[PDB]
């Protein structure tokens, strides 16, 4: 059966640079076309780079001509995307995809590219239940985590142990350009005030994880 | 350079309709166009290469045709397996480009929001921002005018939404309006109201700052 197995993804700064592998088994690569292809965070598929079989004829987009290298060692069947002078607009999941048929019939897993140009870890705020909620009825509640770079960060609630009416948002970039998002998740009202409900916020870029207890406001 | 021009870029269908999303080429281009199905955090898969030819395994439901510089991706009976992402490609000669996607979702029936608003924690003022939430809980369709009213006037320019993919088990929607403001402009007024529209209702839900 065909694989394709994508390495080498992580945190670079501007300027920096890193090496994407490709690992290909029930297939000899030496045989095929092998394409990169890149699609960043919420957007479409765009292509990065090709390389033939035999003569190891290069193609890159426009975009990444003379910054990145595609290459194969067919002893290792293995196919390479080195990446240097990486800029911002580089951060994507990176795609390693076999040729054919004037299309990419083989895809491997994708692995994570995020050029950061700062660190910094969230502050968490709570989104307080109403005091207005409607007893034997549900309330909201959540936790506001604002102001880190850069993606992601990871919600849960009371330890994993609290995942049913969980919403956790997609992030924002602010005008900051920091992310901001809010994780909310509705409860039963008559449990507000003797349950006790905590947000658990990892960021692992930083290696800070904050945890928050969210209660009602006292009057 | 060549372009592809995908529309529509989301769509909503039921299972058993009929979908058909279409690829505009900038140019005369070659023939040598693929369709690809994409599910959230997993690579795209073939279904179409040359066009019109199915790739094998894709089921016979879907089809591809081109008239002009117009290429038309058919699923002919939605299926549920089928809710997902669908992209074009064009090659020509080495320069690939693709189409910027068609998100194909389910319909379901309609469904007011539950609507909460939540003030800024006294936390976050003492760092001299104030960050207002307003939540639209489970509801559908997605559109909706969420209008922040601060002592009955309306705000422009300083709030920013958030919306959840369809939920797995509901189809629903939620989404988050935060407005931001300073912690002078803040404490200047009273009355902070989230207004939510859809259709004929239109639900507001507030708070007056300090009052608990
Ligand atoms: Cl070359
Ligand atoms: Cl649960
Ligand atoms: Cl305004
Ligand atoms: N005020
Ligand atoms: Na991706
Ligand atoms: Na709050
Ligand atoms: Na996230
Ligand atoms: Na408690
Ligand atoms: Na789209």
């Known amino acids: 059966e065909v694989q394709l197995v994508e390495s080498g993804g992580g945190l670079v700064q501007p300027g920096g640079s890193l090496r994407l592998s490709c690992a290909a088994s029930?297939?000899?690569?030496?045989?095929?076309?092998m394409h990169w292809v890149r699609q960043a965070p919420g957007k479409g598929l765009e292509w990065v780079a090709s390389?033939?079989?035999?003569?190891?004829?290069?193609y890159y987009a426009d975009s990444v001509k003379g910054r990145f290298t595609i290459s194969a060692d067919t002893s290792k069947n293995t196919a390479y995307l080195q990446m240097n002078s990486l800029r911002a607009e580089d951060t994507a999941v990176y795609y390693c995809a076999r040729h054919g048929y004037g299309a990419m019939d083989y895809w491997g897993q994708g692995t994570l590219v995020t050029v950061f140009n700062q660190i910094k870890g969230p502050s968490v705020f709570p989104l307080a239940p109403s005091s207005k909620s409607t007893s034997g009825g549900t309330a909201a509640l959540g936790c506001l985590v604002k102001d880190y770079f850069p993606e992601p960060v990871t919600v849960s609630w009371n330890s994993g142990a609290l995942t049913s009416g969980v919403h956790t948002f997609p992030a924002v970039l602010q005008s900051s350009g920091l992310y901001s998002l809010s994780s909310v998740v509705t409860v039963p009202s008559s449990s507000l005030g003797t349950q006790t409900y905590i947000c658990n916020v990892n960021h692992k870029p930083s290696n800070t994880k904050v945890d928050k207890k969210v209660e009602p406001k006292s009057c | 350079d060549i372009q592809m021009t995908q529309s529509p870029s989301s769509l909503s269908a039921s299972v058993g309709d009929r979908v058909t999303i279409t690829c505009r080429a900038s140019?005369?281009?070659?023939?040598?166009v693929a369709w690809y199905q994409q599910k959230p955090g997993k690579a795209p898969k073939l279904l179409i290469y040359?066009?019109?030819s199915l790739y094998s395994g894709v089921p016979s439901r879907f089809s591809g045709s081109r008239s002009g510089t117009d290429f038309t991706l058919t699923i002919s009976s939605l299926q549920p397996e089928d809710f997902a992402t669908y992209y074009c490609?064009?090659?020509?000669?080495?320069?690939?480009?693709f189409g910027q996607g068609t998100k194909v979702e389910i319909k379901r029936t309609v469904a007011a929001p539950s609507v909460f608003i939540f003030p800024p924690s006294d936390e976050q003022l003492k760092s001299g921002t104030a960050s207002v939430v307003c939540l639209l809980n489970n509801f559908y369709p997605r559109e909706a005018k969420v209008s922040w009213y601060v002592d009955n006037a309306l705000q422009s320019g300083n709030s920013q939404e958030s919306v959840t993919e369809q939920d797995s088990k509901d189809s629903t929607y939620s989404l988050s309006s935060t407005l931001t403001l300073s912690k002078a402009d803040y404490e200047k007024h009273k009355v902070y109201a989230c207004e939510v529209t859809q259709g004929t209702t239109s639900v507001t839900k507030s708070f007056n700052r300090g009052e608990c």
């Open positions: 490609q064009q090659s020509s000669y080495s320069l690939i480009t």
């Open positions: 390389i033939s079989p035999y003569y190891s004829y290069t």
């Open positions: 140019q005369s281009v070659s023939s040598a």
């Open positions: 029930g297939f000899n690569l030496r045989s095929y076309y």
């Open positions: 040359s066009a019109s």
